[PDB]
């Protein structure tokens, strides 16, 4: 098989219908698509993408165009890994534990119970923020931990990690925006990779 992590680009690069996406096959015509700019959710590459949805369902995610980040390319993960939100496991309503069973609940009741529990726990709480969060979402999680819980037990690392990692991120990464850039990568005479499979 074709077998490339970037195969979808060919579908987007073909100037004709010769190469088509099997997932998108016969799904819609251009006029039937609501098209929006977007960013991929999957890795730190942050590629510009174009999400196309018909009938409220996302049908494809084209590569977009951002010369400073991704030129006009994707990987298959970014281009096609969008169905996760509609596989039928999505949480549609707030859920509450009662009698050991997870039951659908209102927003009012759910917030009541969550506030009760969190106030009962007070500072004996820790917030695992995970890595699937927008900058705003992470900021809200952190601020919520700092004030609403009066705790510093905040970690977005849902993965193997270490204290040395947090120390390094504080020392060199955090607060240091827009240093090395993709454009710089292209011209770096020598690139070394430590624990990194690009």
């Amino acid at each position: 098989p074709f077998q490339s992590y970037f195969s979808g680009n060919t579908v987007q690069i073909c100037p004709v219908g010769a190469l088509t996406g099997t997932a998108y096959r016969f799904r819609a015509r251009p006029f039937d698509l609501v098209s929006s700019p977007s960013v991929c959710e999957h890795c730190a590459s942050g590629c510009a993408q174009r999400t196309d949805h018909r009938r409220g369902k996302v049908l494809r995610r084209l590569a977009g165009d951002e010369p400073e980040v991704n030129e006009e390319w994707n990987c298959d993960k970014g281009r096609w890994a969008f169905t996760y939100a509609t596989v039928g496991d999505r949480i549609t309503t707030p859920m509450l534990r009662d009698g050991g069973v997870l039951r659908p609940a209102s927003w009012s009741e759910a917030l009541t119970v969550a506030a009760a529990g969190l106030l009962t726990a007070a500072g004996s709480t820790g917030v695992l923020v995970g890595g699937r969060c927008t900058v705003e979402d992470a900021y809200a999680y952190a601020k919520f931990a700092r004030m609403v819980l009066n705790t510093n037990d905040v970690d977005f690392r849902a993965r193997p990690h270490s204290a040395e990692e947090a120390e390094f991120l504080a020392a060199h990464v955090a607060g240091q925006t827009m240093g090395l850039r993709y454009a710089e990568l292209e011209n770096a005479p020598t690139v070394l990779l430590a624990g990194f499979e690009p």
Binding site: F26, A28, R29, F31, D32
Partner: protein, 58 residues
């Protein structure tokens, strides 16, 4: 003769002896033009296959 001003009467009286022209819908519906834009219809080939290819051009 002042009669011209009364021509309308001659009209209405005359019409009440010519036959009414109303179409008899629904017992006797009127003839709609052959080209009329009636309800869309999806057609088939003589073997029964649906003509529509789902191109969404319509």
């Amino acid at each position: 003769k002042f009669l011209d001003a009364l021509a309308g009467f001659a009209v209405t009286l005359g019409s009440m002896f010519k036959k009414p022209i109303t179409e008899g819908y629904p017992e006797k519906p009127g003839p709609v033009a052959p080209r009329y834009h009636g309800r869309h219809q999806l057609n088939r080939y003589p073997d029964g296959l649906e003509k529509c290819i789902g191109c969404e051009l319509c």
